[PDB]
Amino acid sequence: STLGAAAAQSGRYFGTAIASGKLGDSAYTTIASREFNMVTAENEMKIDATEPQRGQFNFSAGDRVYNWAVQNGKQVRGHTLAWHSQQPGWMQSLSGSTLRQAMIDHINGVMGHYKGKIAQWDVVNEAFSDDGSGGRRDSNLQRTGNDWIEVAFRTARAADPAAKLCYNDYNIENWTWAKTQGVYNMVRDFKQRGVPIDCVGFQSHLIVGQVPGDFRQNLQRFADLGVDVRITELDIRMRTPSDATKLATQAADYKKVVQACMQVTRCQGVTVWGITDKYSWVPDVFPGEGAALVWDASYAKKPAYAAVMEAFGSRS
């Protein structure tokens, strides 16, 4: 009778991003423990949250989410080890070999701490540009060398040989996009040379009524590379206010995305980025847009809920 349980029927999972700060919200926690069987810390395990000062790791917030998740019979997705965004001030200032080393020490430290606790990590996040060239994003990390990604994955594997290592990114859900091609070729290259990479995370921060038509095919192509694929931060935004028609379309979009995963044997699961629309990051990064999740601001199930349930238990 829950989404996680429905997903479980086919050996898949349905997860969400958990914000420790909201673990006090009874309505929030109620849905959190019942509906999902997979958890991603929304912010608690990022670079700035885990290593505030170089060499000075603080896993308080992260462990808060991990314990809660475990206490509630849920697995946890590690997010994230290397990223240009949300870096602590000390790291932002670093560059060159020092940054490279700081990146490496960070991976070891964080993974050393969760070794045996968290089995999958979004090692590198959003390394490709959105400029339309399909090339790497020009970040302080990228400037340390084009090989920083590979190094991050090799480091992660060495730190914990049992963790599934994922590359995570957005705007790579459509095969015709430059960005998607850029990511595909990297992964393909990684698989050819033996670089440690087990999965590709498709953030899937989509637009209502504009879900890539080849979403399933694209997922399959990546899976054919020999890596698992996962929808890691699903939310389908619309221009607010929401209305019956937009909500219905959203329901259909949600079913398409989940159904696409159901048709790709290597698609391990779907994680929606949040529980209720009232705590969604969407309105902040995309002004005028929102109502992207399965529960509205009043914690009421949206039409998408039944669509997701339907997508997991049947095929059109």
Automatic annotation (TrEMBL):
- GO terms assigned for molecular function: endo-1,4-beta-xylanase activity
Listed A to Z, the keywords are: Carbohydrate metabolism, Glycosidase, Hydrolase, Polysaccharide degradation, Signal, Xylan degradation
Which cysteine-cysteine pairs are annotated as disulfide bonds in the entry?
A: 166-199
Q: Which residues form the GH10 domain?
A: 1-205
Q: What biological-process GO terms show up in the record?
A: xylan catabolic process
Membership in a protein family:
Belongs to the glycosyl hydrolase 10 (cellulase F) family.
Query: Under which name does UniProt file this protein?
Result: Beta-xylanase
Native species of this protein?
Streptomyces olivaceoviridis (Streptomyces corchorusii)
Which taxonomic lineage is given here?
A: Bacteria, Bacillati, Actinomycetota, Actinomycetes, Kitasatosporales
